[PDB]
Design a binder for this molecule. Sequence first.
Ligand SMILES: O=C(O)CCC(=O)C(=O)O
Ligand SMILES: O=C(O)[C@@H]1CCCCN1
Ligand SMILES: [Co+2]
Length: 286
Amino acid sequence: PQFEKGATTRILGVVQLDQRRLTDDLAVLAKSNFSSEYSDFACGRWEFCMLRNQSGKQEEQRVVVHETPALATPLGQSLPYLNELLDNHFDRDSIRYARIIRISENACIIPHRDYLELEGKFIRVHLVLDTNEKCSNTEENNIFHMGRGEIWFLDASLPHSAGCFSPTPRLHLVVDIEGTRSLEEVAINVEQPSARNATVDTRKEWTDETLESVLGFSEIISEANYREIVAILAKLHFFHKVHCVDMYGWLKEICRRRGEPALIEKANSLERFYLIDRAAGEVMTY
Ligand SMILES: O=C(O)CCC(=O)C(=O)O
Ligand SMILES: O=C(O)[C@@H]1CCCCN1
Ligand SMILES: [Co+2]
């Protein structure tokens, strides 16, 4: 499948981070209750917690297009530096959600598009809090590293993923801005980024040998191992030069070769759910 372009994913600004104050709030987050919502998108320990949402209540853990300035949750009110960053670098009344998104060692989010279930869209922006060179984000055919203190706009309507392959977890502050806002006006009190060369793409060329190894999962794929296989497929594009949606084609061919109708139907359902269309509240299972 092919996907219409949108606003360009890029660095909106760079900010200084107070390491002492940040360290304190990150230490709280290391012991905090992360949501299990959207675990249907997680390949391992990809997870988030709400700092601001519609109601200001901990129970509210899913997103919907809405019209009100986001209210801090008890967790958000307990993280004074992160609360200050939200106050300082964004317009309060434009925020619809604010979250911390943590990826732990060898985890990723499955390649997907956001907003399919929404009546509208958000402008999604990431402020990188704690990362390392073994953490990357992807978009289509591209891989890139979002660095500490950078505020990025991500076009979440293009297929994309994110992973962490370090022992140390990766934390981003992720803000959903009301979708009609002027993107260029979203980040406040920032330094404009100095021009950069592209992130260096160190991934391996994709070969016939690698593809045949993968398609060979047809001999063992089953309901019992379907999730592990999907996760393996999802992680390949962090290390091999392929498009992040290619895994859905691989899965379809694996299942075609196996010849079991249930697995073929499931593979079609996965592509549909992650990339094409979803209803509000719809969850995918294995
Ligand atoms: O970097 C991440 O953890 C998530 C990227 C993503 O899929 C999103 O923000 O929609
Ligand atoms: O838009 C959201 O909040 C979620 C994030 C995780 C992937 C699915 N969509
Ligand atoms: Co996303």
